[PDB]
Amino acid sequence: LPEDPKWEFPRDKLTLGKPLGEGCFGQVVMAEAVGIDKDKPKEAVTVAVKMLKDDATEKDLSDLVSEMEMMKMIGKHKNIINLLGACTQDGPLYVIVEYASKGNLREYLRARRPPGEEQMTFKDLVSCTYQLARGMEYLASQKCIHRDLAARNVLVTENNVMKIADFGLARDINNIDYYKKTTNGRLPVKWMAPEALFDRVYTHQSDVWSFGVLMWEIFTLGGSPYPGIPVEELFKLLKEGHRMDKPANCTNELYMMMRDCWHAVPSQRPTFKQLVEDLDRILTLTTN
Numbered sequence: 001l002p003e004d005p006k007w008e009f010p011r012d013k014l015t016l017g018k019p020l021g022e023g024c025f026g027q028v029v030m031a032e033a034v035g036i037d038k039d040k041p042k043e044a045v046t047v048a049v050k051m052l053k054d055d056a057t058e059k060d061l062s063d064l065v066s067e068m069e070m071m072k073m074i075g076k077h078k079n080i081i082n083l084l085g086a087c088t089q090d091g092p093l094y095v096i097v098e099y100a101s102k103g104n105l106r107e108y109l110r111a112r113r114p115p116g117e118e119q120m121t122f123k124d125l126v127s128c129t130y131q132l133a134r135g136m137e138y139l140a141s142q143k144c145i146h147r148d149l150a151a152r153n154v155l156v157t158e159n160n161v162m163k164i165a166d167f168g169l170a171r172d173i174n175n176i177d178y179y180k181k182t183t184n185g186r187l188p189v190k191w192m193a194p195e196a197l198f199d200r201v202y203t204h205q206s207d208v209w210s211f212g213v214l215m216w217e218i219f220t221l222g223g224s225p226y227p228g229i230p231v232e233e234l235f236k237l238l239k240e241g242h243r244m245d246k247p248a249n250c251t252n253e254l255y256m257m258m259r260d261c262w263h264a265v266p267s268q269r270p271t272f273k274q275l276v277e278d279l280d281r282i283l284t285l286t287t288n
């Protein structure tokens, strides 16, 4: 790892704390970082720190490296988790990101279902969706394809800002090998545009498909996509025209928007720009 001046953070100025989560990928812990906020070199900030586990593979390391590199290349946006820094020298790779106090969106929505712990309003659901469409519209404009959009990969801040996170599978638009049989082999099937597998390509419009599944997760308050259907049967069902059903208490219009995202023809799906404008309208006219 060639030393990156702008991004390197002093190992001695970081204090690791309570664990946040553990996957096949690695582990994330809470931590205090003194001075990561220049110009407040006095002040210690709660952060999240992503790193490898003891059983990590070569691929694990290079995936953590790529996730970090990707986060450096996309600018600041309100609806994307910010990279804060990295310890890359003389020790294990630590990737320091901004801390979100309310966890991932799936858990967040589940914990605040109706009792049959601040219940979600319809407006709140529309607002979440709108925020996420704005984040994706930004990402698309930066030539980034995320490829792993899901409620579990969204973070919720203290003030309920939605933060697209987990850039572990994300790529520059030009950094996918079209038509090779191994391309898109590691994308979660239930969130994946059909063309990602059938055609072995990935465009912003493939992210749109994923966005649709995310919307469905939002409106079911964190439900599981295609319930009762196994992943090995899904594509056969999708070619035949199966689509998930309307969530209770979701409007007809928001459901048509989901369905549009699940158009078999990529170019017939809305753009993120169109999703933003539509959701902006629905949110505002709800308010009034």
Ligand SMILES: CCNS(=O)(=O)c1ccccc1Nc1ncnc(Nc2ccc(N3CCN(C)CC3)c(OCCN3CCOCC3)c2)n1
Residues within 6 Å of the ligand: 018, 020, 021, 022, 028, 030, 048, 050, 097, 098, 099, 100, 101, 102, 103, 104, 107, 152, 153, 154, 155, 165, 166
């Ligand atoms: C999608 C991202 N993907 S990731 O970056 O790979 C990644 C993968 C896994 C975990 C974290 C990340 N990332 C990341 N980055 C910045 N911030 C955060 N915050 C955060 C995350 C989880 C929780 N959980 C999960 C366990 N649940 C039971 C609820 C709490 C959480 O709760 C915070 C409140 N707790 C209360 C108890 O004491 C500690 C503080 C806050 N996570």
